[PDB]
Design an enzyme around this catalytic site. Structure first.
Site, PDB file in Angstrom:
ATOM      1  N   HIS A  77      -5.163  -8.709 -10.070  1.00  0.00           N
ATOM      2  CA  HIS A  77      -4.057  -8.778 -11.004  1.00  0.00           C
ATOM      3  C   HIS A  77      -3.549 -10.210 -11.122  1.00  0.00           C
ATOM      4  O   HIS A  77      -3.838 -11.069 -10.288  1.00  0.00           O
ATOM      5  CB  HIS A  77      -2.926  -7.876 -10.540  1.00  0.00           C
ATOM      6  CG  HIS A  77      -3.183  -6.422 -10.769  1.00  0.00           C
ATOM      7  ND1 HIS A  77      -2.174  -5.484 -10.778  1.00  0.00           N
ATOM      8  CD2 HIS A  77      -4.333  -5.741 -10.985  1.00  0.00           C
ATOM      9  CE1 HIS A  77      -2.691  -4.287 -10.996  1.00  0.00           C
ATOM     10  NE2 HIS A  77      -4.000  -4.415 -11.122  1.00  0.00           N
ATOM     11  N   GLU A  84      -0.527 -11.471 -10.707  1.00  0.00           N
ATOM     12  CA  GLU A  84       0.330 -11.910  -9.600  1.00  0.00           C
ATOM     13  C   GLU A  84      -0.485 -12.200  -8.345  1.00  0.00           C
ATOM     14  O   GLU A  84      -0.260 -13.218  -7.671  1.00  0.00           O
ATOM     15  CB  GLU A  84       1.409 -10.866  -9.292  1.00  0.00           C
ATOM     16  CG  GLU A  84       2.328 -10.513 -10.463  1.00  0.00           C
ATOM     17  CD  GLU A  84       1.797  -9.325 -11.258  1.00  0.00           C
ATOM     18  OE1 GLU A  84       0.792  -9.486 -11.975  1.00  0.00           O
ATOM     19  OE2 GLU A  84       2.372  -8.221 -11.138  1.00  0.00           O
ATOM     20  N   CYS A 121       3.325  -4.287 -10.303  1.00  0.00           N
ATOM     21  CA  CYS A 121       2.951  -2.963  -9.824  1.00  0.00           C
ATOM     22  C   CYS A 121       3.170  -2.875  -8.314  1.00  0.00           C
ATOM     23  O   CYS A 121       3.490  -3.875  -7.674  1.00  0.00           O
ATOM     24  CB  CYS A 121       1.495  -2.684 -10.188  1.00  0.00           C
ATOM     25  SG  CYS A 121       0.287  -3.587  -9.161  1.00  0.00           S
ATOM     26  N   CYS A 173       1.075  -5.453  -6.438  1.00  0.00           N
ATOM     27  CA  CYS A 173       1.508  -6.826  -6.645  1.00  0.00           C
ATOM     28  C   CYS A 173       2.872  -7.072  -6.019  1.00  0.00           C
ATOM     29  O   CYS A 173       3.117  -8.147  -5.457  1.00  0.00           O
ATOM     30  CB  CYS A 173       1.524  -7.148  -8.141  1.00  0.00           C
ATOM     31  SG  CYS A 173      -0.136  -7.503  -8.705  1.00  0.00           S
TER      32      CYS A 173
HETATM   33  C1  LIG Z   1      -4.722  -4.922 -14.104  1.00  0.00           C
HETATM   34  N1  LIG Z   1      -3.272  -4.814 -14.117  1.00  0.00           N
HETATM   35  C2  LIG Z   1      -2.995  -3.514 -14.306  1.00  0.00           C
HETATM   36  N2  LIG Z   1      -1.681  -3.364 -14.288  1.00  0.00           N
HETATM   37  C3  LIG Z   1      -0.916  -2.140 -14.513  1.00  0.00           C
HETATM   38  O1  LIG Z   1       0.448  -2.414 -14.663  1.00  0.00           O
HETATM   39  C4  LIG Z   1       1.158  -1.157 -14.551  1.00  0.00           C
HETATM   40  C5  LIG Z   1       2.490  -1.375 -13.877  1.00  0.00           C
HETATM   41  O2  LIG Z   1       3.131  -2.584 -14.289  1.00  0.00           O
HETATM   42  C6  LIG Z   1       0.192  -0.193 -13.832  1.00  0.00           C
HETATM   43  O3  LIG Z   1      -0.297   0.763 -14.769  1.00  0.00           O
HETATM   44  C7  LIG Z   1      -0.973  -1.098 -13.417  1.00  0.00           C
HETATM   45  O4  LIG Z   1      -2.228  -0.451 -13.388  1.00  0.00           O
HETATM   46  C8  LIG Z   1      -1.105  -4.551 -14.109  1.00  0.00           C
HETATM   47  N3  LIG Z   1       0.346  -4.895 -14.030  1.00  0.00           N
HETATM   48  C9  LIG Z   1       0.759  -6.274 -13.842  1.00  0.00           C
HETATM   49  N4  LIG Z   1       2.187  -6.560 -13.759  1.00  0.00           N
HETATM   50  N5  LIG Z   1      -0.243  -7.295 -13.657  1.00  0.00           N
HETATM   51  C10 LIG Z   1      -1.641  -6.988 -13.734  1.00  0.00           C
HETATM   52  O5  LIG Z   1      -2.357  -7.932 -13.623  1.00  0.00           O
HETATM   53  C11 LIG Z   1      -2.109  -5.512 -13.984  1.00  0.00           C
HETATM   54 ZN   LIG Z   2      -0.255  -5.603 -10.067  1.00  0.00          ZN
END
Ligand SMILES: C[n+]1cn([C@@H]2O[C@H](CO)[C@@H](O)[C@H]2O)c2nc(N)[nH]c(=O)c21
Ligand SMILES: [Zn+2]
Ligand SMILES: C[n+]1cn([C@@H]2O[C@H](CO)[C@@H](O)[C@H]2O)c2nc(N)[nH]c(=O)c21
Ligand SMILES: [Zn+2]
Lengths: 157, 157
Positions: free
Chosen positions: B52, B54, B82, B85
């Site tokens: 992700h 973060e 999430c 993160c």
């Molecule tokens: C790859 N990815 C999936 N989610 C998705 O964000 C949702 C909750 O915020 C969740 O559905 C999670 O899977 C991501 N969220 C953020 N903030 N950053 C990411 O890189 C990311």
């Molecule tokens: Zn995340």
């Protein structure tokens, strides 16, 4: 087989402590009964506070299988996964988690009180579906013993 | 300063989704107004479901500064972090989190319904005392619109 792979995760914890890679935590990821990754905490080696045993294992397994989901795989963690690691396990879609020591065992030798509500079933915004087994008997004894055996053999973080 | 770095995180989200690196998520880590890392989601590029935005920014910042704690740094996330993160942010000892869009804006285009109890104050076991700011006004509106704007440029993974 649960006991065999949990004991391998504990072995990883000891090896990682021994060579200074990180703290006393290990994780093994298996596809049926074939080990797909076997790792321990790499926080100190990698200068990376995200490099817990479980996260490291997930990254190595995803590379080994050339995909970002591990829905056919199970994970063995020497210690109850933290909120970061349990979130990673959720995103990876691992179908089953078996863990050895309760988190309080790591807290007792100086790590953060840092417990995943979704693992213990008290989450409100985060709800898990995967099958979770806390080890008992000999697996629990081995996993708990890790923390008394490795006390002040490594640098906390 | 908050608007500038949040805007930088939003631009990272657009850049990452445009070159195929991952979903529309960005994160910027700053050390007293100096950018330490500026990253986006790399799950697809890295074949790594933990990559992700973060997490990627924490890895990069820690390697740059040669330390595993970022206690003098702040993180700007285009979207609410999430559970994985937010756990990484906790472990990294970042002193402040500013985020743009609520998690529901990402869920509204099909992402996992996967929200951090400790961020929203709804846990039994996991607490946080991390300083957390949800942006408002202009940059918040822009950050919220990221998901409708990029819906078509990538496929959910
Ligand atoms: C790859 N990815 C999936 N989610 C998705 O964000 C949702 C909750 O915020 C969740 O559905 C999670 O899977 C991501 N969220 C953020 N903030 N950053 C990411 O890189 C990311
Ligand atoms: Zn995340
Ligand atoms: C590197 N590390 C620190 N903790 C810490 O152990 C406590 C209880 O879970 C928490 O403080 C967590 O951060 C780890 N836990 C597991 N399961 N695996 C790890 O690699 C780990
Ligand atoms: Zn962990």
């Amino acid at each position: 087989s649960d006991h065999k792979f949990l004991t391998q995760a504990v072995e990883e914890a000891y090896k990682g402590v021994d060579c200074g890679d990180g703290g006393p935590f290990g994780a093994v990821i298996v596809h049926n009964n074939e080990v797909v990754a076997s790792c321990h905490n790499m926080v100190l080696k990698y200068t990376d506070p995200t490099a817990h045993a479980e996260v490291t294992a997930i990254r190595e397994a995803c590379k080994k299988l050339n995909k970002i989901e591990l829905s056919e795989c199970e994970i063995y963690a020497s210690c109850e996964p933290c909120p970061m690691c349990f979130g990673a396990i959720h995103l990876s879609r691992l179908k089953r988690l078996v863990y050895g020591a309760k988190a309080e065992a790591a807290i007792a030798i100086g790590f953060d009180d840092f417990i995943a509500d979704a693992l213990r079933g008290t989450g409100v915004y985060q709800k898990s579906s995967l099958e979770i087994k806390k080890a008992d008997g000999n697996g629990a004894a081995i996993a708990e013993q890790v923390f008394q055996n490795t006390k002040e053999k490594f640098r906390l973080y």
